[PDB]
Enzyme design. Structure first.
Site, short mmCIF file in Angstrom:
data_model
loop_
_atom_site.label_atom_id
_atom_site.label_comp_id
_atom_site.label_asym_id
_atom_site.label_seq_id
_atom_site.Cartn_x
_atom_site.Cartn_y
_atom_site.Cartn_z
CG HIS A 1 -24.78 20.20 -28.91
ND1 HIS A 1 -23.90 20.96 -29.64
CD2 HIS A 1 -25.66 19.68 -29.79
CE1 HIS A 1 -24.23 20.90 -30.92
NE2 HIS A 1 -25.29 20.13 -31.04
CB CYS B 1 -23.32 19.10 -34.34
SG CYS B 1 -24.17 20.61 -34.50
CD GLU C 1 -21.75 22.71 -27.20
OE1 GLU C 1 -21.92 21.91 -28.15
OE2 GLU C 1 -22.13 22.47 -26.03
#
Length: 165
Positions: free
Chosen positions: A31, A131, A55
């Site tokens: 993402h 992230c 992910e």
């Protein structure tokens, strides 16, 4: 203590980060990857093998993008209870290695997206923008990467990295 070489693998990318596993392989969290792109690191998508699930995103490039690096072992998560460091880079340039007690690999629903994840408890928190940061641990005296940072609980005491299945 992560050597400088290993830190040099953490690479700003999209809304977060990615990690050079080897001269040819770059991993990050799906993402953060920007969409509608045709050229990653100057390489057209036609020249990159891109796998994306749970992910966890992996690019395999056609050419040596980081020839300076040795190849590290990538693993589908780590043994339960293992202590990993999340090698967080901040935009500041500050390096924030977070020690984490790793729990179980489990598929999760995180804000809709399905995550093939591994939870971990922090033993200094993660924030929006972290992230893609890699989760690494040492084995003998090789370094191993086992996932990329993907989420944390509202407390922030528990974090989740995505792993490759």
């Amino acid at each position: 203590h992560a050597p400088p070489t290993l830190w040099s693998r953490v690479t700003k990318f999209g809304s977060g980060w990615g990690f050079w596993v080897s001269p040819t392989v770059f991993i990050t969290t799906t993402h953060v990857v920007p969409t509608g792109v045709k050229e990653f690191f100057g390489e057209p998508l036609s020249s990159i093998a891109i796998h994306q699930a749970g992910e966890f995103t992996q690019f395999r490039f056609s050419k040596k993008m980081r020839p300076d690096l040795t190849g590290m072992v990538l693993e589908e998560g780590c043994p339960e209870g293992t202590v990993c460091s999340v090698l967080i880079k901040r935009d500041s340039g500050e390096l924030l290695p977070l020690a984490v007690r790793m729990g179980a690999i489990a598929s999760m629903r995180i804000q809709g997206r399905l995550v093939h994840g591994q939870s971990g408890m922090l033993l200094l928190g993660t924030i929006p923008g972290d992230c893609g940061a890699p989760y690494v641990h040492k084995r003998g005296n090789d370094w191993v990467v086992c996932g990329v940072h993907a989420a944390a609980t509202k407390s922030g005491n528990t974090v989740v990295c995505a792993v490759q299945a």
